[PDB]
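Project standup — Tuesday

K.O.: blocked on the structure for the chain from last sprint. Re-posting the sequence here as requested.
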Amino acid sequence: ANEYAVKTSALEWDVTDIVKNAIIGGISFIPSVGPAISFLVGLFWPQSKENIWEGIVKQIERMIEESALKTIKGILAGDIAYIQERMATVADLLDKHPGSEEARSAFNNLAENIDGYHKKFNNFSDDVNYQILPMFSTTVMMQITYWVAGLERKDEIGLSNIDIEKVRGLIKKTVEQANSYINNIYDRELNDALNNSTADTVANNVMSVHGHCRLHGIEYISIWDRLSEAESVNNRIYVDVLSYSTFFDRQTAKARIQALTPEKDMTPPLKPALNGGKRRKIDSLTGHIVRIGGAARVGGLTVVFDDGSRHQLGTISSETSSISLNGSRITSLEVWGNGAVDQAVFTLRDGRSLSLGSPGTSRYRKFHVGESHYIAGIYLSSDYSPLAGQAANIAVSYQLIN
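H.V.: unblocked you, prediction finished:
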């Protein structure tokens, strides 16, 4: 009816992160179009594994209404299966006979037939559409990468000017439709969570929408936007879009202030600032430990960025332990707590870790999206007097980095 309730996963995940990483790194090492198309096939339909669509379904199916889920699985069983076989066939024909009419016809025919597959994953109810957004965005990326890879290598395929202009129109129309669609459902869901949540739930309800739509939509757009402009899959792309987590484990007024800030106006330390087109890196972290009944607990956190800017979060203490990131990125944050932050463990890519506090519970929550998403910002607050200085919540922002 009215009171908003989160419709997606409580935690943040990405099944398409291997695809995104390979794309933003480019495939300049693959000169031939045949191997280039085969390399794409290996991303979306990995050998001897489930494809990306099936992997997304396994993550979200527990939340999908049954009749909609049966329709979705039928699409994967038929349409998605046909594309794998056809694209593999097109890749082999381009490999064996690079300039032949047989291979070019197969590419152009497949280029036409994949037009509109993205609409198969936004033809449901508004709620199911929102839930399967990663399925829509994955299908769009499959379309754009196939079209652009062939268009970039149009001389090796032998495309005519009519073929070239047709593929261009497909890329342009599809990117505009996807950007329009993703931003439309993002804006609607964010407004629903902002105005129809209670005071006790609005912070995590809003952050959840930001996380879902930016990790499974906005950061996608940043990738294929560059792909369509350059008409190339050979360039190294930097994605400055951030996605977000919810607050663990008690929402406070300071957390609400952050969550209710428009994403474009969010400040450090939760959202790292832009410098020269790059998001600033975290230079060091200083944890502040408070004693609650003799036990070590997280009280506060100091975040220093590579520009020297310092950000004090939570309670200042005389018991501290720090770590210098030395240019390495935070791959995971693990927190134990029940109504508060008992212990927090930051793990860096280089193997080092910083552990703060001690667990007073088994209740646990991991901030970790995958191998190509890194914690780029942190927020923490202790504005809950019953906790007597102990941190009440913590949240992070993720960035896709090659």
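K.O.: great, moving the ticket to review. Residues 238-402 form one domain. The chain is about 45% helix and 20% strand.
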